[PDB]
Design a protein around this motif. Structure first.
Motif, mmCIF file in Angstrom:
data_model
loop_
_atom_site.group_PDB
_atom_site.id
_atom_site.type_symbol
_atom_site.label_atom_id
_atom_site.label_comp_id
_atom_site.label_asym_id
_atom_site.label_seq_id
_atom_site.Cartn_x
_atom_site.Cartn_y
_atom_site.Cartn_z
ATOM 1 N N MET A 120 0.832 -1.195 0.000
ATOM 2 C CA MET A 120 0.000 0.000 0.000
ATOM 3 C C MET A 120 0.864 1.240 0.000
ATOM 4 N N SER A 121 1.994 1.152 0.678
ATOM 5 C CA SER A 121 2.900 2.334 0.754
ATOM 6 C C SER A 121 3.596 2.565 -0.592
ATOM 7 N N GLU A 122 4.040 1.460 -1.164
ATOM 8 C CA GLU A 122 4.711 1.375 -2.445
ATOM 9 C C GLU A 122 3.773 1.924 -3.546
ATOM 10 N N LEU B 191 1.084 3.813 -3.095
ATOM 11 C CA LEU B 191 0.790 5.201 -2.828
ATOM 12 C C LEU B 191 1.830 6.220 -3.267
ATOM 13 N N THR B 192 3.069 5.782 -3.409
ATOM 14 C CA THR B 192 4.180 6.573 -3.883
ATOM 15 C C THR B 192 3.958 7.031 -5.336
ATOM 16 N N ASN B 193 3.475 6.115 -6.145
ATOM 17 C CA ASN B 193 3.257 6.385 -7.614
ATOM 18 C C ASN B 193 2.569 5.119 -8.167
ATOM 19 N N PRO B 194 1.238 5.238 -8.120
ATOM 20 C CA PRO B 194 0.338 4.188 -8.534
ATOM 21 C C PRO B 194 0.537 3.614 -9.926
ATOM 22 N N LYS B 195 0.713 4.527 -10.872
ATOM 23 C CA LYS B 195 0.855 4.105 -12.287
ATOM 24 C C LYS B 195 2.176 3.387 -12.516
ATOM 25 N N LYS B 196 3.150 3.780 -11.667
ATOM 26 C CA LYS B 196 4.482 3.101 -11.810
ATOM 27 C C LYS B 196 4.355 1.741 -11.175
ATOM 28 N N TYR B 197 3.544 1.626 -10.147
ATOM 29 C CA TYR B 197 3.300 0.338 -9.456
ATOM 30 C C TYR B 197 2.402 -0.574 -10.314
ATOM 31 N N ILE B 198 1.345 0.018 -10.871
ATOM 32 C CA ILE B 198 0.400 -0.722 -11.745
ATOM 33 C C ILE B 198 0.216 0.011 -13.089
ATOM 34 N N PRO B 199 1.177 -0.171 -13.996
ATOM 35 C CA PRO B 199 1.151 0.401 -15.344
ATOM 36 C C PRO B 199 -0.189 -0.027 -16.003
ATOM 37 N N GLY B 200 -0.938 1.004 -16.452
ATOM 38 C CA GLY B 200 -2.235 0.677 -17.063
ATOM 39 C C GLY B 200 -3.411 1.015 -16.188
ATOM 40 N N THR B 201 -3.155 1.211 -14.872
ATOM 41 C CA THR B 201 -4.227 1.540 -13.927
ATOM 42 C C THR B 201 -4.858 2.879 -14.320
ATOM 43 N N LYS B 202 -6.164 3.005 -14.122
ATOM 44 C CA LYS B 202 -6.878 4.219 -14.413
ATOM 45 C C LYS B 202 -6.980 5.180 -13.229
ATOM 46 N N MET B 203 -6.514 4.799 -12.042
ATOM 47 C CA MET B 203 -6.552 5.772 -10.868
ATOM 48 C C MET B 203 -5.650 6.937 -11.263
ATOM 49 N N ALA B 204 -6.259 8.079 -11.332
ATOM 50 C CA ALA B 204 -5.572 9.324 -11.747
ATOM 51 C C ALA B 204 -5.076 10.123 -10.539
ATOM 52 N N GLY C 168 -1.353 11.008 -8.768
ATOM 53 C CA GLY C 168 0.077 11.117 -8.918
ATOM 54 C C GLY C 168 0.836 10.513 -7.762
ATOM 55 N N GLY C 169 0.358 10.406 -6.535
ATOM 56 C CA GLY C 169 1.236 9.710 -5.524
ATOM 57 C C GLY C 169 1.566 10.600 -4.357
ATOM 58 N N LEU C 170 1.940 10.009 -3.259
ATOM 59 C CA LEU C 170 2.318 10.696 -1.970
ATOM 60 C C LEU C 170 3.813 10.400 -1.811
ATOM 61 N N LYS C 171 4.637 11.415 -2.044
ATOM 62 C CA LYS C 171 6.095 11.233 -2.034
ATOM 63 C C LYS C 171 6.726 11.077 -0.655
#
Ligand code: HEC
Ligand code: HEC
Lengths: 108, 108
Positions: B69-71, B73-86, B88-91
């Motif tokens: 969940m932490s991983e 939350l950092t950058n969703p699209k980088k974690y799940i390429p293709g995901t539609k959650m728009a 950007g992430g909590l740095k």
């Protein structure tokens, strides 16, 4: 100004997690390490009833508004050299905006 | 783990200001842009009842724990390429810790 309102919800939690250790904001709230902040806006520094301020604070004679408050919150000791508030400061303007939105609201 | 509990109060406001726009966390809460997160922990990705996930999410088959969940939350699209959650992430890890402490607590 230079200040923009933010989230008061957000500011409430900043307060609880960064300011509550030493201050109250409620009307009839008590002085603790720091003075009670109820009615701080539009007031000058060092005038909370019953509190032992340092000379620095008193002498600074800051008129407390949202803008002043932001500057102070960035780095208190740099703003008031000699002040005894042992708080390093809120570097992000977004955090400060939130907190001040909350203070604006709770200190009235 | 790699995760440290933080402030649930703090996490509640992060949620309201960064996640609520598209998600609910309450039991019996509704799917909105994003799926309801109640009971997400210990669950795999894409299994919220009645929600139209993208293939990416489903296929990722992540087991949802605090660390994962932490991983994410950092950058969703980088974690799940293709995901539609728009989102950007909590740095900052401190923000994530707080949020997850809150989610941990509210999604149960
Ligand atoms: C204890 C470790 C403190 C924390 C955390 C915060 N403040 Fe503070 N504050 C503290 C003291 C001891 C004093 C008096 C300083 C002196 O030199 O006499 C203050 C003062 C203030 C003021 C000025 C008040 C006035 O002029 O009436 C303000 C506006 C203020 N403090 C606000 C404030 C906020 C919003 C904080 C959280 C981000 C915060 N302080 C932290 C002690 C401590
Ligand atoms: C709308 C702009 C969103 C915001 C803001 C946040 N999320 Fe999201 N989330 C959104 C969508 C459309 C989806 C589905 C994506 C897909 O590809 O199908 C998601 C998904 C999640 C998940 C995965 C859920 C599951 O596998 O069951 C999680 C854990 C999640 N979202 C959490 C979350 C948090 C905590 C947010 C605030 C920091 C957040 N999301 C923002 C849409 C949107």
């Amino acid at each position: 100004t230079e200040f923009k309102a933010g989230s008061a919800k957000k500011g409430a939690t900043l307060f609880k997690t960064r300011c509550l250790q030493c201050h109250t904001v409620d009307q009839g709230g008590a002085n603790k390490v720091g003075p009670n902040l109820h009615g701080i806006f539009g007031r000058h520094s060092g005038q909370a009833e019953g509190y032992s301020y340092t000379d620095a604070n008193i002498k600074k004679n800051v008129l407390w508004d949202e803008n002043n408050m932001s500057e102070y919150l960035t780095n208190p000791k740099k703003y008031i050299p000699g002040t005894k508030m042992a708080f390093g400061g809120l570097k992000k303007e977004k955090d400060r905006n939130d907190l001040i939105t909350y203070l604006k609201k709770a200190c009235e």
